[PDB]
Structure formats: structure tokens, C-alpha cells
Amino acid sequence: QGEPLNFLSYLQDIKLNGLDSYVLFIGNARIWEELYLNSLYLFSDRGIRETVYTAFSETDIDNLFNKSTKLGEQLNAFYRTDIFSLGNADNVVKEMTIEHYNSLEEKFKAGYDRYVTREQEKSTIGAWFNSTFSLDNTDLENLTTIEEILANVEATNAILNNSNAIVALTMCKSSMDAVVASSNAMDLLGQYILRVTTESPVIRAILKNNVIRDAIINSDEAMTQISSNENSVMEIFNDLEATKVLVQNQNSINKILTNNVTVEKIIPNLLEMKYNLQTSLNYINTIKSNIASGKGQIMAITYNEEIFPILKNAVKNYDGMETTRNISQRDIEEKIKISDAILESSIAMATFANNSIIVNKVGDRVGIIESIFSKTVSLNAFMKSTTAINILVNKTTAFTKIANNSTAFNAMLTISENNVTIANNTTAMGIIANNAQAMSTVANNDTSISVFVNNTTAMGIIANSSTAMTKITLTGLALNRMVKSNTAKSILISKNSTLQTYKNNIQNTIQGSTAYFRTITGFADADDNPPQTINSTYVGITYCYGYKGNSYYGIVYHGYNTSIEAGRGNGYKDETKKFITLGGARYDQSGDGYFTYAMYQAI
Amino acid sequence: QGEPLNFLSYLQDIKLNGLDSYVLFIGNARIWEELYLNSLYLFSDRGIRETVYTAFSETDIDNLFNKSTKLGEQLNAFYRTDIFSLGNADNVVKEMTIEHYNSLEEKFKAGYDRYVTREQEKSTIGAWFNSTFSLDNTDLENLTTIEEILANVEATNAILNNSNAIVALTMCKSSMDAVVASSNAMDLLGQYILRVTTESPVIRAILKNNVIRDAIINSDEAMTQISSNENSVMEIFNDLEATKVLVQNQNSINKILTNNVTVEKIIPNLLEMKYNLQTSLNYINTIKSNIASGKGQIMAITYNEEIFPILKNAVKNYDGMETTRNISQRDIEEKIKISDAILESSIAMATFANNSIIVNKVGDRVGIIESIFSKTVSLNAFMKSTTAINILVNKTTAFTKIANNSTAFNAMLTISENNVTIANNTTAMGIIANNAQAMSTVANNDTSISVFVNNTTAMGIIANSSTAMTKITLTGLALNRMVKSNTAKSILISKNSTLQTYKNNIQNTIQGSTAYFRTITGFADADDNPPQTINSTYVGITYCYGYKGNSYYGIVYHGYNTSIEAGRGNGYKDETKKFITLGGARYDQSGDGYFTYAMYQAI
Ligand SMILES: [Mg+2]
Ligand SMILES: [Mg+2]
Ligand SMILES: [Mg+2]
Ligand SMILES: [Mg+2]
């Protein structure tokens, strides 16, 4: 037999009774201790593991650390590993690393902390560090508090450059509390990171350690060091939780943005990434169905309700492909989360929205603006930044994507100054004016259409776009605002034929939309010239023809410029001899003409 | 008698905890071994059997075979039987048969294999054989390799005349390889080994030597043995070159067809396989493009002209998928080759074409007939087998597929007896007559149409098919043969309206195809009744109308039965009052009628 029989009976009763076992009653602690100090089976019996971990009191963990002559073997059995050194707690602490420490559960982490505190409080902290890890530093020897150690750079680095001593230093709650409090220690810690940045396991283990991670990312000093090395920052964005901590600290964001490589290459790649990753994930999920089908072809050939033996490998291969594929999927789904952690941070997005290098990258790189559109926070941050729009209005591809995304377009138009920025850009206005959806949004947005029709550039382009005109001439609001604009009246009167193209749309919209137009003069016949009226809010509709259908002409000119003819006509009254006038009207005759005329006003 | 208490506690913990028991943790292997080497209760406790079998590592089974002094008792308890001899592994091996070996589960079969390999590959192979199976041979005692044994005739004969020693020999890959390698290999296989075992290892080792393979596959004796074991035959079709040798020997094909499992299950699967494999290969090649695209998405995110480090794994994963996929592809491409080796063998195909079980499988199983169509040899073998066609004419789906495949249809019609078989089958004739493509092939095939139009069944169906008729009435050859047929003339004159439906087709085909029709009498007008002519190869075309367009009737009757009216007409000459007569014509009038008539003859 390996262990005594009563130990086996104790394990049986623990399995059968959980925490209700007589073994785990406080009154029987004496035997319970004897078990966990001497049994290996207790720590290798997974079927009771959940109970055992719960049963361990703080005193029990202290007893383990202080008394067990095989704490290493018991930890190795308890975590199904071999990473811990054999023997008592001193052998375990001597070979402990941050990675191996992170493999521990909470109770054993706390046990490590308390044990190291006890051992330091026996002798002195400096002498304990020096002798335990053989740091061979006499300066450290005579230091009696953690503050005295942090005042000495030589001793601090002697500790930090030891994989085990750093675990002792960082994972002792009080000691760590001093390190966070010291402005100098943080700096040294930051420098430590820079040295390890190319030892991938070490840096990854550091970033998976919540205490060190959180202290480093939120430290002004440490980040200052780390930001200088783009490859260190790279490792932070390779870890989801570290990224989540980072994108919630304004100061650390600014710090990493002090590095030109980070700004130019790392951040745009992190933004561009989600689009490429989602596309790759679509291909992965297509491969899943293709694997299922190709395997189903093989499965259909049966032999005693089993696979046809000659094809057995063909099945196994298809399963292998399904394994690796699944792996791929997981990995990709992880990286997307990282992107989502960045895109969902208003702190990180707003800042990026006011950085001109990053916004130029958004404009230049296919995929970044798609990723930005994939989240509300990132979308609003960029669409509502007048700086970002001021840059992006010159990026035709990105701005076309904005104009086609109704949500991003509407978000962009919530800022008036963005409307002004757009109006003064010939390219952008050219895109919008020839986009039926966008022009539909603009025509029903008072601010946007009011800015556009009163801007010489935008209104110049709109007048040359049959799409935009159409929409505007069918919308009461837009037609009202356009009629009131002197810029629009001037441009349209210089392009009279374009104006008259939409005479029916204009008549119908004016007469229909009483919310935006009122009648000044109902239709009336006139043998002699009616008195001219000039008012920059007026719209006239005038039938010109001859008296009793003779061959003499009625002529109508715009009110906003009474020298520009809007139209003329002889013969009989007719829908083709009916003309729109802007800003009023002036009436004239060549011979005995005749008019049937009405006047309206934009409210 | 009785087992120690800790063993009972171990069994109890195994029951309570399954694989989570401390007993089954690798770190406690020492006690686990001590259990399974010394306990029978472990092997007779059915309540934990599934766990125990799962817990056994390869090393554990090796330890059992090497060290247990009661392997026989433990095997008997574990399989609730008495077939294994008592004592250690040597006693068990001494009485082992193929029957008892096959009753073992995979782990213990593998254990037997590894144990006998270890014992034979030592320098005590001769002594082990000698003592284990009680061969009373002192020469064998001192032989140290299998080659030294095969050089000695006495020792070989001592071993081979023991069936169990042969089992031990055959389950050891290297030893078997020597037997295949030995100069008198054939003899040894013929006289001793094959009689006792045709199992998979034997056939596998035989197939690695081209000479021994070819001799075995072409041996009437050996095949007779091998054919009785369907799983041995399975191993031959799992090897391309062995299949290529097999499908070139008529006698060996017949031998393997003496096994009903081979005929009913193995051969149809080998035939059905190519279709499923080609479909799976299409899916594989789609996966190739999907992997390329999904990887290209990741490759586009660069950093100093290298992959963005955060995505490095995403690249490797995509390469891994490309590795496994490629493996899959090769394997599938191999199996197709095997199918092609079978389909391209006229010997193997012809034989299968005259096996009613296999032909019924061809008719019943989707995929087999496509595979057969995929190769010229296999297609011609089945389409030209009158037995196969005699079965397939009753398989509606398969025969429709034949009728739609122009190549298979044309191949089938090269055999006259196949035409006879089809003509007398209502189903088949129903499919062909309503298939415009097939009827096109038939109408231009002298033999097929000649058989069809002279058969009361086929000709009965053709007369009711507007498709078939159409084709026939537009083809000189077919119309000639149909006109000459007395069966067809009888059926068609009994269906006079159906005949007259195609009067224009018939007129055009007769006048156009001078190769198949000649004019006896050019069109001529007639006031009085022309003299009747009767000839079973004649076709008449007769316009019937009134004299000078009056309301009196001309009437025309068929020559083959001068009492059956073909048509009548009054008024003026007209294309609707024109009638076909078969076998000659008889003319009559109701009042002063009038005719314009011509007579033709099928050459
Ligand atoms: Mg007048
Ligand atoms: Mg006048
Ligand atoms: Mg007459
Ligand atoms: Mg007459």
C-alpha cells in the first residue's frame, strides 16, 4: 500500500459527503491537517477537488506552507503539472515565476503572500531577499523596509532581474502597495518591461498577471517607458484584458500616441483588422459547411452500418481538417474581440478622431472605415468630429462609403459645421448630389439643405444634378429653402432651361405643400401687363399666350433679375407655354399678348 | 485467498470517481500497476469495466503481458469466458487461436501483437518459440533471428506444424516480412500459413513484395483460401497495384465472387464509390480556394513588409488547414484510382455485367450507374451485356438515365438482342418513346427501328407517343421501315386519325428522301375512280375534293385493308383534304368527285 487505509477511508467519506464529511468538521481538524500534510492522493483525486479547495481555510493553507515537506509535489498533483519544484515551501518559492504563479488559484496565491510576509518578518526584508535568491548584493543586505529598497536603484533592479525575486516582490500585497506608491519604482518597473519585451513568454506572463498589468497600464511613469518601445505596446494589444484596461486610461492612450510608429502603423492595423478578420471568419464558416458536405459524401458509403473500411482514413482526414479549422476560428474570434475593445471605447475613439495621422489612415486604407462603422461608439466619434470630417471630405472612397451608409451619413449631418465643410467640397457634393438616398436625407434635413442651397459651390453642383433637383423639386421643405436662397435663385436663373425642366414638380409641390408655401395671387387672366412684383421669397407661375389665340406673344421675366426672360408664348393657353419665375415676376407683351398668372411665397 | 483491503478501497474509489480517481492519476501509476498485475476483482468488476478499459495505457497493457502471472484468469474474467488458458502471457499465447484473438478488444489485440513482436525480435526467438509452444526441437533453441530459423528446415517445420505458433508468427510484422522475403516463400504460404490464417497482417505483408503478391493473386489455391475471408479481399482492394493485378485474372475474380458478402457489399461499394469520391473532391477543391481567400484577408494587414505580429498565428493556422486538406485530397485521389482500375478492366466488368446481384445493385443504388458511365470499358461491358439489359429494363430510374446518356444508349443499341429485350418491355418502351433524344437515335438506327416497328408491343406504344411518331415521320429510314411493317400498318390504320395527324411530315419525308422512297405514280388528276393498287410497301397521298369545287365527295381507303376509309373531301382542292394511305389505295366517289393522287414505295 502507498498511503494508510484510514486516509483512503477519509477520501471515500469526502467523496460521499462533500463538506458534510466528519473529516471536514472543525472539531476534527487534527486529522484533517494530518491528511493534507501527508497525503498525495488527496491532491490527485480530481473527483473531490472542488470540495477540497473549498475546505481549505486560511489556517489550513498556512499550515501547508509552513509544515508540508512536499508542497511542490502536492501542487503539481493538484494542478496536473510539473512546473513547481519539489520539497517544502522554500524550494517552491525559490523556483517560482510569474507564469507559474498565475497558474495558481486564489487561496494559494494568498498563501504565498502570507508565507513570504512571515519569512520577511522573521529576519529583515533586505537580508531575506538577498539570501533567499542569492542576489549577492550587500546594499540590499542592510535595508530594513521596502521603502529603503525602492530608494536604492541597484537593489531594486537586483530584485527585478531575478525571475523568482520579482514574484516575491510583486505578489506581496503590502510590498506591491509601496511599489505602486513610489514614483521611482514604477519607472524601474517600466524599464524592466522594455528589457523583457523580446522574451515572449516572460512578457505574456507579465500581461496575464492582473496586479502587475493594472499597475503598469495605469502608471504615468511606466507607460512613459513602454510607449517608447512600439514592440512593447504590440504585446499589450495582443492581450484582450490588457487592451481593455488600456483603452480606459486617457493618459496612457496619449502616452502610446507619443510614438510615431504606434500612431502610423500599429493603431491603423488594429482598426483595419476587424474587417479583414470578419471576412476571413466568413470564409472559415463556409469551410465548415464544405467539410461537412465532403465528409457526408464519404459517410454515405456504408458497410454493416459502419464506414466502408477502405475509406476510413478519408473520414479521419475530414475530422482533422475540422479540428484545425475550429482552432483557426477561435483564434480569429479572439482578435476581433480586441478590435471591439478598441472600437467600443469612447476615450480611445474620440482621441483617435482628433488625430490627423490616424484620420488620414482611415481615409486612405480600405477597411478601416468599415470597422469604424461596425460600432456605434466608433461611428459617432468619427462622424461627429469636425476635424475628422474636415480631413475625410477629401477622401473620395471613404466619403462615398459614408454617403452609402445611411447611419454614418445621418450621424455626420447632426453637426452643422460638418454641413458647411461638405458644402465647400466639390468632390463630396458631386457624390451626394448623384446619390438618390443621400439627396433624400439632405432634402428632408432643414439644416443640411439650408446650408447647401445657400452655398455657391454646393448649389452650383446641385443645379447640374438631375437627381438632386428632382428630389428638391418634390420636397416642400427643400424647395422652400432653395426658393428663399438668393444664391440658388441666381444660379437657377442663369440656367433657366434647367429650371423650367422641373416646372411641373415645382407647381405640384407648391400647390400641395401648404405647410411651406402660401398663395399670394390665385390664377388670373390678364390682357394688359400685370404690375411687376419683386420679392426674394416669391415664386410665380405664368401662362403666356396670345389674345383670343392670336400669334402675338406674352413674355415673363424673373423677379430676382427682371432682365432675364423666363419664357414666352403665343397661340392658345397650353401647359408647354407655362413658366416658373423666381423672386417675383415682370410681364411684357410683343403685340396684343395675354397672361394667366399666379404668385406664391415660400413661408 | 481474498485480495488486500487497499485493493478494495481502490476499486471503490474507481467506482465512485471514474477516471477522476486518484488511482488513475499518472502520478500514482505505481499503485495502479500493482492493482492490475495482482487483482482479479478489478477484471471481474463489471460496474467499472468501461473505466478500466479506458484507463489502460499502452504501457499498462505491456506491463500486463510482461509481468502478470495470471493474464489468462484476468482475460477470462474481463470477457466473462473460459477460452483463454491460465497463467502468464506465454501460456495464453500457446493456446491462442484466430477465433479467440478476434474476440479481444483493440487494446488487448495490440498487446498480443506487441508482446509477440518483443519476444520474437529478441535473440531468444528460437528458445521462446521452442518452449512456449512445446516444440521438441533443439536446433530451434539456439537460433537468434527469424532468418536463422528460415534457413533451418527442421526448425521451420517444427514451428509451422503448430497453428498457435503460426498465429504468433503472423502477428509479428518483421517475422512475417522475413517469410515473404524467404526464397521458398510460396510453399510456406501455400502449405502452412494461409491454411491457418488469411488475416489482414498476412495479406499486407504479401502485398509489399511484387513477386509473392503476383504469384498469390494468380494462384488458384491461395485465392480459394483468401476469397473465403471478405476482410482479406478488402485489403487487396485497399492497394492499387494489387487491385490492378487482381482485375486481370478471370479465375481470381470468379473466386472472390464465390463469397456472397463480397458480391453483395464490397463490389457494389467499390462501384458506387467513384461518384461520391468525385463529389467530395469537388468540395475539397472548393475548400482550397476558401483557405486561399481567408488567408489572403489576413496577409493584407502588413507591418514592415511582414505579417502583423498579432496575426501571426492566424497565418499558421491557415497553413495547417492547407496541410491537412492536401493530405485529404491525395487520399481521395488514391481511392478514385482504385475505382478506375476496376472500371477499366474488361475482364472484371464483363463478369460483373453477368452477375444478377451486382446488376440489381446497379439498378437500385444511386451513383453506381454514373460511375459505370464514367469509363468506356465499364460502360460497354454493361450496355452490351444482354443479361444486364434484361435486368435494367425494369429499373425505371436507371433505364431513364441510360436513355438520357447518348453514349450508353448507342452502346446498348449495338446488340440486336438488346433491341428485342427492349421492344417487349412496356416500361422501357414507354421511356424511350417519350424521349426526343433517344427516339432520334432509334429512328436513325436501322436495327432498332426495324425491331420496334415489327413488334406489337413497342409499335403499340410508339403509335400512342406523339414524340416518337414525330421523329419517325421526319426520318426517311424509320418511315420506310414502319411503312413496310405489316404490324405497324395494321396498328396505324386502326388509328387512322393518329396517322393523318402526321400527313405533312409523311409527305415531306417521302418526297425529300429519295434514298428510301421512290415514286410509282406522280401526282395526277382524276375525274373517275383510279384503279386500286395493293402492295404492302406502298404509300399513297390523295387529295379528295369535288368536281369543279362542287359539294360531292372523293373518298380514299387504305390498300392494306380496302374497307377502312383513310379520308374524304368535297369542295376545292385543299391541304386539309389530303390523306395518307398505307399498303396501297382504293378510290371511290359519292357523286361526281375528283382526285389528285400520287403513289410511292418504300425501297
Ligand atoms: Mg394684351
Ligand atoms: Mg391690347
Ligand atoms: Mg367525278
Ligand atoms: Mg364524272
Side-chain angles (χ1 to χ4, degrees):
Chain A
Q1 62 173 21
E3 304 192 1
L5 294 172
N6 59 325
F7 281 16
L8 313 182
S9 281
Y10 297 162
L11 299 176
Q12 297 300 316
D13 198 82
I14 290 172
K15 174 56 179 189
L16 290 176
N17 285 125
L19 298 166
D20 293 349
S21 173
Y22 60 85
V23 180
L24 304 184
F25 178 59
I26 185 58
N28 300 323
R30 182 269 180 194
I31 69 163
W32 170 230
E33 190 181 11
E34 181 169 356
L35 187 60
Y36 61 63
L37 289 182
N38 293 290
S39 184
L40 284 182
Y41 297 168
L42 177 71
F43 295 87
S44 49
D45 191 354
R46 242 265 270 104
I48 65 172
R49 195 187 183 281
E50 299 191 64
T51 302
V52 173
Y53 184 84
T54 304
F56 283 135
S57 72
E58 222 168 275
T59 297
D60 294 332
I61 299 288
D62 289 339
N63 279 326
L64 270 183
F65 274 84
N66 294 334
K67 303 175 181 182
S68 181
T69 71
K70 51 198 172 196
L71 183 62
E73 291 88 333
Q74 290 163 331
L75 289 176
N76 284 332
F78 203 62
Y79 292 97
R80 302 162 156 189
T81 179
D82 57 354
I83 63 184
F84 303 106
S85 78
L86 303 193
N88 57 15
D90 274 3
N91 294 152
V92 176
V93 170
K94 277 174 201 262
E95 300 294 339
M96 182 72 64
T97 64
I98 294 287
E99 181 186 328
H100 300 163
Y101 174 95
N102 288 337
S103 292
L104 296 169
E105 291 163 301
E106 182 54 38
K107 290 186 177 189
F108 287 102
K109 291 181 173 159
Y112 179 93
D113 181 12
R114 296 195 305 279
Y115 176 76
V116 166
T117 313
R118 286 194 297 276
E119 293 312 298
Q120 289 178 30
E121 278 170 15
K122 289 174 187 183
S123 66
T124 54
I125 176 176
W128 180 82
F129 269 108
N130 203 40
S131 64
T132 301
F133 307 99
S134 308
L135 302 180
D136 204 17
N137 187 307
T138 295
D139 296 342
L140 180 59
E141 185 67 16
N142 301 122
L143 303 177
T144 65
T145 60
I146 185 59
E147 289 81 7
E148 288 184 348
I149 295 170
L150 298 181
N152 188 325
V153 174
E154 297 298 325
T156 305
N157 287 117
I159 292 179
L160 294 176
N161 287 304
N162 189 293
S163 316
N164 325 98
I166 192 178
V167 179
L169 178 73
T170 59
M171 305 291 94
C172 175
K173 195 266 188 188
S174 65
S175 171
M176 189 61 187
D177 282 341
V179 179
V180 168
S182 164
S183 186
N184 181 28
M186 280 300 108
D187 191 59
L188 297 180
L189 191 56
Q191 309 193 339
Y192 175 75
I193 297 304
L194 296 183
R195 292 189 286 286
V196 301
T197 300
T198 60
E199 294 292 323
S200 204
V202 187
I203 185 63
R204 293 187 214 291
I206 290 288
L207 299 177
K208 290 187 178 185
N209 184 305
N210 65 316
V211 169
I212 300 181
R213 179 199 64 199
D214 290 5
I216 282 183
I217 299 287
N218 302 304
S219 167
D220 186 71
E221 291 79 3
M223 286 310 308
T224 293
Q225 297 281 345
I226 293 172
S227 300
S228 69
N229 186 350
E230 50 268 38
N231 297 337
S232 305
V233 174
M234 185 85 68
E235 289 296 292
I236 297 170
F237 287 118
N238 201 28
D239 183 303
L240 180 57
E241 300 306 310
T243 297
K244 285 184 180 172
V245 175
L246 173 58
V247 299
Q248 289 308 319
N249 190 308
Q250 186 66 81
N251 195 63
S252 304
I253 295 291
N254 301 333
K255 289 285 179 209
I256 72 162
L257 292 172
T258 70
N259 188 316
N260 295 114
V261 177
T262 302
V263 179
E264 188 183 350
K265 305 188 181 180
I266 296 186
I267 302 289
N269 278 350
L270 293 166
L271 294 172
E272 191 175 13
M273 207 165 46
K274 173 162 180 193
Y275 181 74
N276 293 58
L277 291 173
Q278 261 165 351
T279 308
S280 198
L281 192 57
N282 294 334
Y283 282 111
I284 288 286
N285 290 128
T286 297
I287 291 168
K288 192 186 186 190
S289 295
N290 291 326
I291 287 176
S293 303
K295 187 188 178 190
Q297 289 297 316
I298 307 304
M299 294 293 292
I301 304 289
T302 65
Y303 175 86
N304 298 130
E305 299 216 301
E306 294 295 329
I307 189 61
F308 193 44
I310 290 177
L311 300 181
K312 69 170 197 192
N313 291 351
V315 177
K316 278 166 186 155
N317 294 347
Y318 265 114
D319 292 342
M321 291 183 56
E322 177 55 30
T323 293
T324 50
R325 187 209 64 85
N326 192 243
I327 291 170
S328 299
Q329 196 189 298
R330 293 288 187 273
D331 175 56
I332 289 172
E333 284 169 331
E334 196 64 20
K335 305 304 167 177
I336 289 171
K337 284 180 194 181
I338 288 171
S339 284
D340 283 348
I342 302 177
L343 297 169
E344 287 175 316
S345 166
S346 46
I347 285 172
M349 286 302 95
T351 306
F352 296 171
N354 292 278
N355 181 289
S356 79
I357 294 175
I358 291 174
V359 175
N360 273 290
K361 294 288 180 175
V362 173
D364 298 332
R365 290 249 209 97
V366 47
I368 300 188
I369 196 141
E370 304 283 0
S371 303
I372 289 174
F373 292 164
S374 75
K375 289 288 190 175
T376 298
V377 167
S378 59
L379 179 142
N380 289 331
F382 274 79
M383 292 303 96
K384 302 186 181 177
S385 169
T386 57
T387 295
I389 298 309
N390 196 63
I391 293 169
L392 292 174
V393 82
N394 301 293
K395 313 287 193 176
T396 68
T397 305
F399 194 82
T400 307
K401 288 176 176 184
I402 295 174
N404 286 308
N405 190 313
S406 179
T407 301
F409 196 68
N410 275 276
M412 180 178 57
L413 299 191
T414 64
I415 312 305
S416 308
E417 298 304 323
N418 285 343
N419 290 294
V420 175
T421 306
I422 294 163
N424 289 306
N425 191 286
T426 294
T427 298
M429 281 304 311
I431 289 163
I432 290 167
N434 294 293
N435 183 309
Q437 186 181 84
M439 272 313 306
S440 190
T441 305
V442 171
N444 289 280
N445 186 336
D446 193 0
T447 301
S448 302
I449 192 66
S450 294
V451 170
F452 285 10
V453 302
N454 285 280
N455 179 283
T456 290
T457 290
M459 185 54 233
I461 289 160
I462 288 174
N464 285 333
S465 170
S466 59
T467 294
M469 285 304 294
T470 292
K471 210 71 69 177
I472 292 171
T473 48
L474 294 169
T475 315
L477 171 61
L479 184 60
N480 176 292
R481 299 295 180 268
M482 193 195 249
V483 155
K484 293 203 198 146
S485 169
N486 290 346
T487 303
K489 282 194 293 293
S490 181
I491 290 167
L492 290 173
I493 286 172
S494 69
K495 303 175 177 298
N496 186 66
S497 302
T498 302
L499 175 62
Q500 304 305 328
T501 291
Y502 304 93
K503 64 176 76 178
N504 292 321
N505 290 13
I506 289 167
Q507 177 169 26
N508 293 340
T509 303
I510 286 174
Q511 293 166 349
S513 188
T514 60
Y516 290 104
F517 291 90
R518 79 170 59 90
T519 301
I520 296 314
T521 298
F523 276 101
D525 301 3
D527 195 315
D528 290 337
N529 284 339
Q532 82 168 23
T533 62
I534 295 167
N535 182 313
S536 67
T537 61
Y538 279 14
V539 189
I541 302 173
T542 310
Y543 292 86
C544 300
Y545 47 96
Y547 179 74
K548 295 292 179 67
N550 65 20
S551 60
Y552 288 117
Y553 286 93
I555 315 165
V556 69
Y557 305 82
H558 299 276
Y560 186 76
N561 185 341
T562 64
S563 75
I564 302 302
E565 185 179 324
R568 73 175 57 203
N570 61 4
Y572 300 87
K573 186 183 179 217
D574 193 290
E575 299 298 305
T576 63
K577 289 174 285 188
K578 161 191 72 194
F579 308 103
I580 302 300
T581 52
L582 298 176
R586 176 174 79 83
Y587 314 87
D588 208 351
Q589 307 185 6
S590 192
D592 202 49
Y594 209 92
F595 302 93
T596 295
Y597 71 102
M599 185 71 57
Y600 307 85
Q601 173 179 46
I603 297 162
Chain B
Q1 290 177 337
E3 304 192 1
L5 294 172
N6 59 325
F7 281 16
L8 312 182
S9 280
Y10 297 161
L11 299 176
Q12 205 147 328
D13 198 82
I14 290 172
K15 173 56 179 189
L16 290 177
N17 286 125
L19 298 166
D20 294 349
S21 173
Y22 61 85
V23 180
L24 303 184
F25 179 59
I26 185 58
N28 301 323
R30 290 183 181 177
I31 69 164
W32 170 230
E33 189 182 11
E34 182 134 356
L35 186 60
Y36 61 64
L37 289 182
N38 293 112
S39 184
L40 278 71
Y41 297 168
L42 177 71
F43 295 87
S44 49
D45 191 354
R46 186 183 228 149
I48 64 173
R49 196 187 183 281
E50 297 192 358
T51 302
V52 174
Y53 184 84
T54 304
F56 282 136
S57 72
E58 228 170 26
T59 297
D60 294 332
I61 299 289
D62 289 339
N63 279 326
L64 268 183
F65 274 84
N66 294 334
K67 303 175 181 182
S68 181
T69 71
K70 51 199 172 196
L71 182 62
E73 292 88 333
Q74 290 162 331
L75 290 176
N76 283 332
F78 203 62
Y79 292 97
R80 306 192 36 100
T81 179
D82 57 354
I83 63 185
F84 303 106
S85 285
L86 303 193
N88 57 15
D90 276 3
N91 294 151
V92 176
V93 170
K94 171 184 181 157
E95 301 294 339
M96 182 71 64
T97 64
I98 296 288
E99 180 190 44
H100 300 162
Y101 173 86
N102 286 336
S103 72
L104 296 168
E105 291 163 300
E106 181 54 38
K107 290 186 177 189
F108 287 100
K109 289 181 289 188
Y112 179 93
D113 302 1
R114 295 195 305 279
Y115 176 76
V116 298
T117 54
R118 286 195 298 275
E119 292 311 298
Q120 291 177 32
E121 278 170 15
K122 290 173 187 183
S123 66
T124 55
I125 176 176
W128 180 81
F129 269 109
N130 206 42
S131 64
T132 301
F133 306 98
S134 308
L135 301 180
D136 206 18
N137 186 307
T138 339
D139 294 344
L140 180 59
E141 187 68 16
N142 300 122
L143 303 177
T144 65
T145 60
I146 184 59
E147 289 81 7
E148 288 184 349
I149 295 170
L150 298 181
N152 188 325
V153 175
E154 285 295 326
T156 44
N157 296 124
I159 292 180
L160 293 177
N161 287 303
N162 189 293
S163 316
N164 323 97
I166 280 188
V167 178
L169 179 73
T170 59
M171 299 305 314
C172 175
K173 191 265 188 187
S174 64
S175 292
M176 182 50 96
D177 281 342
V179 179
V180 189
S182 91
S183 63
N184 64 333
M186 284 305 297
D187 294 317
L188 299 181
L189 293 167
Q191 304 193 304
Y192 309 85
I193 296 172
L194 293 182
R195 292 189 183 177
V196 179
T197 171
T198 60
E199 297 292 322
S200 203
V202 188
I203 308 301
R204 294 183 78 85
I206 290 178
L207 299 178
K208 295 177 181 188
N209 185 305
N210 66 314
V211 169
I212 300 301
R213 176 201 62 197
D214 291 4
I216 284 287
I217 299 193
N218 302 304
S219 167
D220 187 72
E221 294 82 2
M223 283 314 303
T224 293
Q225 304 160 334
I226 293 172
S227 300
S228 70
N229 186 350
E230 50 268 38
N231 297 336
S232 305
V233 175
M234 192 87 68
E235 287 296 292
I236 297 170
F237 287 119
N238 199 250
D239 183 57
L240 180 57
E241 300 306 310
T243 297
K244 285 184 180 172
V245 175
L246 173 58
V247 299
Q248 289 308 318
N249 189 308
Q250 185 66 81
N251 195 63
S252 304
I253 295 291
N254 300 333
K255 289 286 178 209
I256 72 161
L257 292 172
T258 69
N259 188 316
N260 67 267
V261 177
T262 302
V263 179
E264 294 172 350
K265 306 186 182 285
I266 296 185
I267 303 289
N269 278 350
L270 293 166
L271 294 172
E272 191 175 13
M273 206 169 47
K274 172 162 179 193
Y275 182 74
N276 293 58
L277 291 174
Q278 261 164 351
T279 308
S280 198
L281 193 58
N282 294 334
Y283 282 112
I284 288 286
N285 291 128
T286 297
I287 292 168
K288 192 186 186 190
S289 295
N290 291 326
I291 287 176
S293 302
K295 186 189 178 190
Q297 291 298 118
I298 307 304
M299 298 284 283
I301 303 178
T302 65
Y303 176 86
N304 298 333
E305 299 154 294
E306 296 219 313
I307 188 61
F308 193 45
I310 290 177
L311 300 180
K312 205 175 290 172
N313 291 351
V315 177
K316 277 167 183 155
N317 293 347
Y318 265 114
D319 292 342
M321 296 182 55
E322 177 55 30
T323 293
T324 42
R325 187 209 64 85
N326 192 82
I327 290 171
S328 299
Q329 198 188 299
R330 291 288 189 273
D331 175 56
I332 289 171
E333 284 168 331
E334 196 64 20
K335 305 304 167 177
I336 290 171
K337 286 178 195 292
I338 288 171
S339 284
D340 283 347
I342 302 177
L343 298 169
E344 287 175 316
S345 166
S346 46
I347 286 172
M349 285 302 94
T351 306
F352 296 171
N354 292 278
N355 181 289
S356 79
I357 294 175
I358 291 173
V359 174
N360 273 290
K361 292 287 181 174
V362 173
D364 298 332
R365 290 248 209 97
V366 47
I368 300 188
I369 195 141
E370 297 76 353
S371 303
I372 289 174
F373 291 164
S374 75
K375 289 288 190 174
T376 298
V377 166
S378 59
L379 179 142
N380 289 331
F382 273 79
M383 294 300 94
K384 302 185 182 177
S385 169
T386 57
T387 295
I389 298 309
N390 196 63
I391 293 169
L392 292 175
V393 288
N394 302 293
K395 311 286 193 176
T396 300
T397 304
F399 195 82
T400 307
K401 289 175 176 184
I402 295 174
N404 286 307
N405 190 313
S406 180
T407 301
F409 196 68
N410 274 276
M412 181 179 62
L413 299 191
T414 64
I415 311 305
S416 307
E417 200 192 328
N418 285 343
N419 290 295
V420 175
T421 306
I422 294 163
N424 289 306
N425 190 286
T426 34
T427 301
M429 280 307 307
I431 289 163
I432 290 167
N434 296 293
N435 183 309
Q437 185 181 280
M439 273 313 302
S440 190
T441 305
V442 171
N444 289 280
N445 186 336
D446 193 359
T447 301
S448 303
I449 191 66
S450 294
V451 171
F452 285 9
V453 302
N454 285 279
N455 179 284
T456 68
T457 289
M459 186 53 230
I461 289 160
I462 288 174
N464 285 333
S465 170
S466 59
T467 294
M469 286 301 297
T470 293
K471 299 293 172 182
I472 292 171
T473 48
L474 294 169
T475 314
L477 171 61
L479 184 61
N480 176 292
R481 298 295 180 268
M482 193 195 251
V483 156
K484 293 203 285 207
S485 169
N486 291 346
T487 303
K489 282 194 293 293
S490 181
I491 290 167
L492 291 173
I493 66 182
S494 292
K495 303 175 70 65
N496 185 66
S497 68
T498 302
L499 175 61
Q500 304 305 328
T501 291
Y502 304 85
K503 64 176 76 178
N504 291 322
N505 290 13
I506 289 166
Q507 177 170 27
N508 293 339
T509 303
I510 287 174
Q511 293 167 349
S513 188
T514 60
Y516 289 103
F517 291 90
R518 79 170 59 90
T519 301
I520 296 315
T521 298
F523 276 101
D525 299 4
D527 194 315
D528 290 337
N529 284 338
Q532 82 168 23
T533 62
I534 293 167
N535 182 312
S536 67
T537 61
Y538 279 14
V539 188
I541 302 173
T542 310
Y543 291 85
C544 300
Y545 47 96
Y547 179 74
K548 298 293 177 67
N550 65 20
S551 60
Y552 288 117
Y553 286 92
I555 315 164
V556 69
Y557 305 82
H558 299 276
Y560 187 76
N561 184 341
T562 64
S563 75
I564 301 177
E565 185 180 324
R568 73 175 57 203
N570 62 4
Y572 298 101
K573 187 182 179 289
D574 193 290
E575 298 298 305
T576 63
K577 289 174 285 188
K578 161 191 72 194
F579 308 103
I580 302 300
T581 52
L582 299 176
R586 176 174 79 83
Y587 314 87
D588 208 351
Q589 307 185 6
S590 192
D592 202 50
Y594 209 92
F595 303 94
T596 295
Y597 72 102
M599 185 69 56
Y600 307 85
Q601 173 179 46
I603 298 162

